[PDB]
Amino acid sequence: MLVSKKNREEVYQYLFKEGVLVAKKDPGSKHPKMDVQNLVVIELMRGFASKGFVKEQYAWRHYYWYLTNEGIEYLRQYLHLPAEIVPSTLKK
Amino acid sequence: TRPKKKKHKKKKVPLAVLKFYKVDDSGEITRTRMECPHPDCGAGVFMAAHKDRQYCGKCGLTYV
Amino acid sequence: FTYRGIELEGLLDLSNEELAQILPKRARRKFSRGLKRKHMALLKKLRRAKKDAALGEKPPTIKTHLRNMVIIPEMIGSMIGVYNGKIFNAVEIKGEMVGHYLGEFSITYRPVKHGRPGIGATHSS
Amino acid sequence: GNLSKKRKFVADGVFYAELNEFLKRELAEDGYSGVEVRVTPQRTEIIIRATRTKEVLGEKGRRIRELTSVVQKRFNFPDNGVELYAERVANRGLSAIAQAESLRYK
Amino acid sequence: IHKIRITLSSKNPKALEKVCAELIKGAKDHKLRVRGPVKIPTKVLRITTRKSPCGEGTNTWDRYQMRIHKRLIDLHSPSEVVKEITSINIEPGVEVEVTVA
Amino acid sequence: KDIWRSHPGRGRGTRRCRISGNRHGIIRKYGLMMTRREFREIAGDIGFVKYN
Amino acid sequence: FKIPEWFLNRKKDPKDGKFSQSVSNVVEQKMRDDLEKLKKVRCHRGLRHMWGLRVRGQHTKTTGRRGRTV
Amino acid sequence: KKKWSREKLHNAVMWEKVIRDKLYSEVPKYKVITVSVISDRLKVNGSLAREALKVLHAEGLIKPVNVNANCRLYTRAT
RNA sequence: CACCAUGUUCAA
RNA sequence: AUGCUAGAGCCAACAGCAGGUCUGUGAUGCUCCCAGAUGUCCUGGGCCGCACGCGCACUACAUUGUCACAGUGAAGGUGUCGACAUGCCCACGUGGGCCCUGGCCUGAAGAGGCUGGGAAAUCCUGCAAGCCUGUGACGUACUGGGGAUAGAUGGUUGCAACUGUCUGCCUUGAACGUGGAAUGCCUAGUAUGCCUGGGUCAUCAGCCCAGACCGAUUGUGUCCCUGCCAUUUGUACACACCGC
RNA sequence: CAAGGCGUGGAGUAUGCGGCUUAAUUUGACCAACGCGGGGAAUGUUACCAGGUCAGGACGCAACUGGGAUUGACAGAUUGAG
C-alpha cells in the first residue's frame, strides 16, 4: 500500500480515539478530521478488515468501520498506548 | 507488438555514506559532497556530485 | 504575403495583444483567456526547432496533440506533426493557415468512399 | 436562511432514506424494523425500532455508541447533536420488513 | 410585547394542523393578540420519472408529488413566553421557526 | 505524476448518483442527486407520493 | 454614405483587412477566392468543400441525400 | 426525384390614361367596390387598387361600408 | 358465398 | 355549479412471455480478464463519420397570408453547496462572487459594466408569452412565400468550440406550386393552432413531461375492416393456425 | 370503422435505426425496436480506437534485505506531455 508513516499514524490515532471511522467512497479527495487521503484511509481499512481488526459496512457511498477487540489490542500494541486509554465508544 | 518498457529500479549502490565521508586520522572526517543550505534542516543531507550540477534531493534544489 | 494587409515583417514584429485584434473572434477570445502552459511550451519548442534547422533546410517535425491550438505568425514555416488519434500528420505551416487550428489541417477520418450496400440496406433485403 | 423549503424537505427525506438504508444493512441480523427521526432542540434524536434491542445494543451500549458516533461523523453533526435509541417493535408480526429478514435468514 | 412570526411547514397536514392548533391554544391561554394561521399556498414538488429502468416498452411515467404545507402565526408576545408555547413539544415532521423584529 | 485524476473540468462525469455512484440519468432537481433508477426505489422514504 | 461598417458584406477581408460590400458577382468571385485559399492549404473545411460535402458541421447521414437511390 | 401531382396574370403595375379615366368614370358606380373587384375589372395591380380605393373615398366618389384587413368594402356614393 | 397459398431442425 | 362511471387520472387480481434490462446499484450465480490488464487514469480521436432505405419531429408551399408599427393579454412552475466548493476569481493573514435576476449606463445588436432583491404568495414576476386585434406596405408573381445552403466576422459558455456549442450583423436564397400506393391520432375545453415552464444543462430543445391561451367540424352508431370478451360448435392443433 | 377534423407518405432540415466507409465509427432493443435506455455524447460521461501511466495485487506463506527492502526527484535527453 506504501503509506507514509505519519499517515499510518494519523489514521490509527483517529481510529483508536473514535472507535469508529467513516470514509467516503470517493478516493481522490481528502477526508475531514484528517490530512490523509480518502484513498489511503480505504486502502488501510481493507487491510484492517481482512486481518479482522475492523468490521466494514458500506451503505450508499460511505464506508463505516468499527474497531474490534482484536483491533483495539493491535492498535494498543502498535501506537504503544497504555491500558488507561480506550476508544470513545468504550468511554461509557 | 513493440518491445516492453522496463520498470525503473534503483542501482542498489552499496554503502553510499562511506564514499560520502573521507575520514582522516591526521585531521578528522572530511565530507566529499557539499551539504545543502536551507532553513529546513539539510545540514546532514548531501547534494549529488553531478558533472555540472550540485543537486539536493530532500529539497529538490540544483546549483550550476 | 499580406495577411489582413500586414506582411510577415509586421506580423512577427507585433504584440499578442495586437494579434488579438488582427486574428478572428475565436482566436481573440482564446487569447483573452491567456492561452495555457502546453501551448506556450509548444511555441517554445517551435522556436527551438527553427533555431535548430536554420539556413540550409527545414525545421524538424515537432509532434503534438494540441489540435486545440491556434496558428499565429510566430508559428509560420514550422513542420508540426499534429495528432489525429492514430498518426502524427506533418503540417508545413504556411501563411494562409493563421487563425485556424491545427485540427483543421490534421484530419481525423478517412474520406468516405462507399461500397456495395449489402443486406439490410433496404426493406427488400 | 441557507436552504429553500422545497430543498430542505427533500433533503430531510434523503437523509432519512440514507439513515434507513444504512441501518437496515447494519442491523439486519437483529430485527431492525424501522427508524424515526425527531429534530428537536439540543438533539436530533433518532429512534431505531428493532425486534431484539438486546443485540441492537452491544456489550454495555457498545454498538449503539458505535452507531451514534458513526452517524455524527458521517452526517457531520455538531457534537452532542444526535442520539440513537432502540425500542422493541410492539408486534414483530405486523412488520413486513422484520419478517422478510427473518425468512431471509432462515 | 414584541412582534413575533412563527412559521410552520410540513409534509403532513394532520401533524401540521395539530401543532398549529396547539400553538393557537397556547397563545390564547394567556391571550397574546394572535393572528391565526395564514395558509401559504402549498408547494407541490412534482417529479415525473420514467418507470422502466431500461428503455423498453410503452414509455410510462411515474408522477410523484411532495406537498409542502406552510402556516404562519403572528403574535405580540415576550421572548420567553413565545418560546415556552413553542417549546411545548412539537409533532415530528413539522419544522417551526420563530422570527422577531 | 500528479496528473492522476486531474481532468480539469466539471460535468456529467463528476455528477454521480449519491447511492449508485452511476452518472447515467441522475435527478438533480431539488438537490436530489439520485439516479432515476434509485429514486423509484427510495421515493416513498423521501416523502414523494404517487397521487396522479 | 454613412452606412456603418457592421452593415457590410466583407467585414474584415483576410488578404486585404478592408471592409467592403461585395456586390454583383464579386460575391461569388470572393467566395471562390476564399475556397481557393482554404483548399490550397489542407484546411478541413476546404477539403469538405472540394469533396462536395456539408461544411460547418451538419450530419451527412440522412439529409443531404440528393437522389441517387442504390 | 419522382414527383406526384394557371396562366399568369399581367396586372398593370402603374396607371395609364384609359384605365385611370375608366376608374374615375365607371367604378364609382359599382354596387360593391373592393381591391379584388377593381383589380379584376381593370386588369390592374392590387396595390394600385388600394391606392384607387383610398383616393376615390377621399375625394368623395365612393363611400366605405366595412373596411378592414380582410375585404375592404366600399360602395357607390349615391 | 370474387380471390385469401406458405411458415427450416432440436428445444419449451 | 353539473348528470358519457360527472370529467381526468392513480392504484389494479390470477396465470404467464424463456418480452427488456447483468451497461442503474456494494443486486447477483457460473464464467472470462487480471499488471504488456477487459482494473484505472491521462492526451487525442470516435460515437456526428455518407453512393442509399426507413421511423419520427420541426418548417413550409402563402393573402382565413408574410413583413412593419402598436395594443390587449396566461398558467404550471424554478431559483443563491445540506454532493460539489476540501475549488476558482475579484478584493484585502482575511471578506465578497458562483442560482434566478430587478433598476441604471454603454452598444446597432449579441452582449457588457454599476448597483440592488430573493432560500422566495415577499425579488425576478402581475414573468406586459405567442396566437389574436387595429393600421400600413405587398398583390397571385417560387413572390416581401420558404429559409435550406454558404461567405467575410462580433460576442457568450467552457480548461478546451477544429468536424462550425449557442448567438449578433450583412450577404447568399435550394427544394417545396398541398404531395402515388399506403397510413396515424382523435368525441368537448376535446382535435388543431399557438407559445410558456420544468427535465436534461457551465453552454446547446426541433425532444420529453406538464402549463395555459384561441377553440371547433362531425358522431351519440355499427360489427363492414382490424381486433377484444362470452356462450355454442368442430378439430388430426397443444411449440396451440406463425399449428399440423 | 362509420361522419368527419389534423395530418403522415411527396420538399428542406432535427434526430433515432439499418447499411456502407473507418483505427474506432462501442452498444441494447426490430403491435409490445427506431426524439427509446430519461442515450440533447466537444472533454470527464464511454463501454470503441491510437498511445502512455498508476495499482487502487487485501491477507497468508517463502525469498531479499538497516555491513539498506523500497520511495521520491533536479538537470540533459525521451515523450503528445514540466
PDB file of N, CA, C and O in Angstrom, chain C residues 86-119:
ATOM      1  N   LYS C  86      -4.454   8.531 -34.273  1.00  0.00           N
ATOM      2  CA  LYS C  86      -3.720   7.376 -34.769  1.00  0.00           C
ATOM      3  C   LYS C  86      -2.312   7.711 -35.232  1.00  0.00           C
ATOM      4  O   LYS C  86      -1.393   6.929 -34.988  1.00  0.00           O
ATOM      5  N   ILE C  87      -2.112   8.855 -35.885  1.00  0.00           N
ATOM      6  CA  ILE C  87      -0.837   9.190 -36.508  1.00  0.00           C
ATOM      7  C   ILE C  87      -0.591  10.687 -36.370  1.00  0.00           C
ATOM      8  O   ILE C  87      -1.509  11.472 -36.134  1.00  0.00           O
ATOM      9  N   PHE C  88       0.669  11.082 -36.523  1.00  0.00           N
ATOM     10  CA  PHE C  88       1.106  12.471 -36.433  1.00  0.00           C
ATOM     11  C   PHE C  88       1.309  12.986 -37.857  1.00  0.00           C
ATOM     12  O   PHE C  88       2.392  12.853 -38.427  1.00  0.00           O
ATOM     13  N   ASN C  89       0.264  13.577 -38.431  1.00  0.00           N
ATOM     14  CA  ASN C  89       0.381  14.140 -39.771  1.00  0.00           C
ATOM     15  C   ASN C  89       1.251  15.384 -39.733  1.00  0.00           C
ATOM     16  O   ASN C  89       0.924  16.351 -39.041  1.00  0.00           O
ATOM     17  N   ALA C  90       2.354  15.364 -40.470  1.00  0.00           N
ATOM     18  CA  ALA C  90       3.199  16.541 -40.564  1.00  0.00           C
ATOM     19  C   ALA C  90       2.491  17.628 -41.355  1.00  0.00           C
ATOM     20  O   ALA C  90       1.809  17.362 -42.348  1.00  0.00           O
ATOM     21  N   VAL C  91       2.658  18.865 -40.903  1.00  0.00           N
ATOM     22  CA  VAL C  91       1.975  20.015 -41.471  1.00  0.00           C
ATOM     23  C   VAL C  91       3.004  21.128 -41.579  1.00  0.00           C
ATOM     24  O   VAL C  91       3.525  21.593 -40.559  1.00  0.00           O
ATOM     25  N   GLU C  92       3.330  21.520 -42.804  1.00  0.00           N
ATOM     26  CA  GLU C  92       4.168  22.684 -43.051  1.00  0.00           C
ATOM     27  C   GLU C  92       3.272  23.907 -42.945  1.00  0.00           C
ATOM     28  O   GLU C  92       2.361  24.089 -43.758  1.00  0.00           O
ATOM     29  N   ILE C  93       3.505  24.733 -41.935  1.00  0.00           N
ATOM     30  CA  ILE C  93       2.588  25.816 -41.620  1.00  0.00           C
ATOM     31  C   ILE C  93       2.879  26.991 -42.534  1.00  0.00           C
ATOM     32  O   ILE C  93       3.936  27.623 -42.439  1.00  0.00           O
ATOM     33  N   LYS C  94       1.943  27.277 -43.426  1.00  0.00           N
ATOM     34  CA  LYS C  94       2.034  28.383 -44.357  1.00  0.00           C
ATOM     35  C   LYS C  94       1.429  29.628 -43.716  1.00  0.00           C
ATOM     36  O   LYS C  94       1.137  29.655 -42.516  1.00  0.00           O
ATOM     37  N   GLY C  95       1.254  30.672 -44.518  1.00  0.00           N
ATOM     38  CA  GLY C  95       0.714  31.910 -44.003  1.00  0.00           C
ATOM     39  C   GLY C  95      -0.795  31.961 -44.057  1.00  0.00           C
ATOM     40  O   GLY C  95      -1.427  32.667 -43.269  1.00  0.00           O
ATOM     41  N   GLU C  96      -1.388  31.233 -44.997  1.00  0.00           N
ATOM     42  CA  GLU C  96      -2.836  31.189 -45.134  1.00  0.00           C
ATOM     43  C   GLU C  96      -3.484  30.211 -44.172  1.00  0.00           C
ATOM     44  O   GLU C  96      -4.626  29.796 -44.392  1.00  0.00           O
ATOM     45  N   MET C  97      -2.764  29.829 -43.118  1.00  0.00           N
ATOM     46  CA  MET C  97      -3.274  28.948 -42.081  1.00  0.00           C
ATOM     47  C   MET C  97      -3.458  29.672 -40.759  1.00  0.00           C
ATOM     48  O   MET C  97      -3.907  29.057 -39.789  1.00  0.00           O
ATOM     49  N   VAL C  98      -3.136  30.955 -40.697  1.00  0.00           N
ATOM     50  CA  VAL C  98      -3.148  31.709 -39.450  1.00  0.00           C
ATOM     51  C   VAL C  98      -4.581  31.885 -38.979  1.00  0.00           C
ATOM     52  O   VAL C  98      -5.499  32.108 -39.772  1.00  0.00           O
ATOM     53  N   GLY C  99      -4.775  31.779 -37.680  1.00  0.00           N
ATOM     54  CA  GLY C  99      -6.104  31.847 -37.092  1.00  0.00           C
ATOM     55  C   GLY C  99      -6.747  30.494 -36.947  1.00  0.00           C
ATOM     56  O   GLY C  99      -7.353  30.196 -35.919  1.00  0.00           O
ATOM     57  N   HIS C 100      -6.616  29.657 -37.969  1.00  0.00           N
ATOM     58  CA  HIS C 100      -7.153  28.310 -37.911  1.00  0.00           C
ATOM     59  C   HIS C 100      -6.425  27.487 -36.855  1.00  0.00           C
ATOM     60  O   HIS C 100      -5.356  27.856 -36.369  1.00  0.00           O
ATOM     61  N   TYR C 101      -7.018  26.357 -36.498  1.00  0.00           N
ATOM     62  CA  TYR C 101      -6.379  25.459 -35.555  1.00  0.00           C
ATOM     63  C   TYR C 101      -5.541  24.428 -36.300  1.00  0.00           C
ATOM     64  O   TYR C 101      -5.563  24.344 -37.527  1.00  0.00           O
ATOM     65  N   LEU C 102      -4.800  23.624 -35.541  1.00  0.00           N
ATOM     66  CA  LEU C 102      -4.051  22.527 -36.139  1.00  0.00           C
ATOM     67  C   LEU C 102      -4.936  21.329 -36.453  1.00  0.00           C
ATOM     68  O   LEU C 102      -4.572  20.497 -37.296  1.00  0.00           O
ATOM     69  N   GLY C 103      -6.087  21.225 -35.797  1.00  0.00           N
ATOM     70  CA  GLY C 103      -7.013  20.157 -36.096  1.00  0.00           C
ATOM     71  C   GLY C 103      -7.732  20.314 -37.412  1.00  0.00           C
ATOM     72  O   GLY C 103      -8.350  19.352 -37.878  1.00  0.00           O
ATOM     73  N   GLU C 104      -7.673  21.497 -38.016  1.00  0.00           N
ATOM     74  CA  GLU C 104      -8.245  21.682 -39.338  1.00  0.00           C
ATOM     75  C   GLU C 104      -7.311  21.201 -40.434  1.00  0.00           C
ATOM     76  O   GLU C 104      -7.764  20.966 -41.557  1.00  0.00           O
ATOM     77  N   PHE C 105      -6.028  21.038 -40.129  1.00  0.00           N
ATOM     78  CA  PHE C 105      -5.059  20.552 -41.093  1.00  0.00           C
ATOM     79  C   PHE C 105      -4.591  19.141 -40.796  1.00  0.00           C
ATOM     80  O   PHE C 105      -3.948  18.527 -41.652  1.00  0.00           O
ATOM     81  N   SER C 106      -4.884  18.614 -39.617  1.00  0.00           N
ATOM     82  CA  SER C 106      -4.835  17.175 -39.406  1.00  0.00           C
ATOM     83  C   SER C 106      -6.254  16.632 -39.358  1.00  0.00           C
ATOM     84  O   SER C 106      -7.045  17.018 -38.494  1.00  0.00           O
ATOM     85  N   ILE C 107      -6.576  15.736 -40.286  1.00  0.00           N
ATOM     86  CA  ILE C 107      -7.928  15.206 -40.434  1.00  0.00           C
ATOM     87  C   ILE C 107      -8.031  13.914 -39.640  1.00  0.00           C
ATOM     88  O   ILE C 107      -7.075  13.139 -39.571  1.00  0.00           O
ATOM     89  N   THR C 108      -9.192  13.687 -39.036  1.00  0.00           N
ATOM     90  CA  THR C 108      -9.367  12.601 -38.084  1.00  0.00           C
ATOM     91  C   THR C 108     -10.115  11.409 -38.654  1.00  0.00           C
ATOM     92  O   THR C 108     -10.307  10.419 -37.945  1.00  0.00           O
ATOM     93  N   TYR C 109     -10.532  11.470 -39.911  1.00  0.00           N
ATOM     94  CA  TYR C 109     -11.291  10.392 -40.518  1.00  0.00           C
ATOM     95  C   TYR C 109     -10.864  10.253 -41.965  1.00  0.00           C
ATOM     96  O   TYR C 109     -10.469  11.235 -42.598  1.00  0.00           O
ATOM     97  N   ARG C 110     -10.935   9.035 -42.479  1.00  0.00           N
ATOM     98  CA  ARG C 110     -10.649   8.807 -43.884  1.00  0.00           C
ATOM     99  C   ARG C 110     -11.893   9.121 -44.705  1.00  0.00           C
ATOM    100  O   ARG C 110     -12.969   8.601 -44.394  1.00  0.00           O
ATOM    101  N   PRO C 111     -11.799   9.982 -45.721  1.00  0.00           N
ATOM    102  CA  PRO C 111     -12.956  10.282 -46.575  1.00  0.00           C
ATOM    103  C   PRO C 111     -13.724   9.048 -47.014  1.00  0.00           C
ATOM    104  O   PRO C 111     -13.130   8.008 -47.314  1.00  0.00           O
ATOM    105  N   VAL C 112     -15.044   9.159 -47.064  1.00  0.00           N
ATOM    106  CA  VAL C 112     -15.925   8.013 -47.225  1.00  0.00           C
ATOM    107  C   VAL C 112     -16.077   7.726 -48.709  1.00  0.00           C
ATOM    108  O   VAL C 112     -16.643   8.532 -49.454  1.00  0.00           O
ATOM    109  N   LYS C 113     -15.571   6.575 -49.140  1.00  0.00           N
ATOM    110  CA  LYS C 113     -15.777   6.062 -50.489  1.00  0.00           C
ATOM    111  C   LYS C 113     -16.497   4.728 -50.357  1.00  0.00           C
ATOM    112  O   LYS C 113     -15.891   3.725 -49.968  1.00  0.00           O
ATOM    113  N   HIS C 114     -17.781   4.718 -50.695  1.00  0.00           N
ATOM    114  CA  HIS C 114     -18.683   3.653 -50.295  1.00  0.00           C
ATOM    115  C   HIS C 114     -18.459   2.389 -51.111  1.00  0.00           C
ATOM    116  O   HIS C 114     -17.788   2.385 -52.145  1.00  0.00           O
ATOM    117  N   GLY C 115     -19.053   1.301 -50.636  1.00  0.00           N
ATOM    118  CA  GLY C 115     -19.036   0.015 -51.291  1.00  0.00           C
ATOM    119  C   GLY C 115     -20.450  -0.463 -51.557  1.00  0.00           C
ATOM    120  O   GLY C 115     -21.401   0.315 -51.574  1.00  0.00           O
ATOM    121  N   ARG C 116     -20.576  -1.758 -51.764  1.00  0.00           N
ATOM    122  CA  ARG C 116     -21.890  -2.324 -52.026  1.00  0.00           C
ATOM    123  C   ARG C 116     -22.753  -2.246 -50.774  1.00  0.00           C
ATOM    124  O   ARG C 116     -22.313  -2.668 -49.703  1.00  0.00           O
ATOM    125  N   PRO C 117     -23.973  -1.714 -50.873  1.00  0.00           N
ATOM    126  CA  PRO C 117     -24.827  -1.576 -49.684  1.00  0.00           C
ATOM    127  C   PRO C 117     -24.997  -2.844 -48.866  1.00  0.00           C
ATOM    128  O   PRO C 117     -25.010  -2.770 -47.635  1.00  0.00           O
ATOM    129  N   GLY C 118     -25.135  -3.998 -49.495  1.00  0.00           N
ATOM    130  CA  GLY C 118     -25.241  -5.229 -48.745  1.00  0.00           C
ATOM    131  C   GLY C 118     -26.557  -5.357 -48.004  1.00  0.00           C
ATOM    132  O   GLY C 118     -27.387  -4.451 -47.964  1.00  0.00           O
ATOM    133  N   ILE C 119     -26.732  -6.522 -47.396  1.00  0.00           N
ATOM    134  CA  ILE C 119     -28.004  -6.923 -46.811  1.00  0.00           C
ATOM    135  C   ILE C 119     -28.431  -5.926 -45.744  1.00  0.00           C
ATOM    136  O   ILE C 119     -27.613  -5.409 -44.977  1.00  0.00           O
TER     137      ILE C 119
END
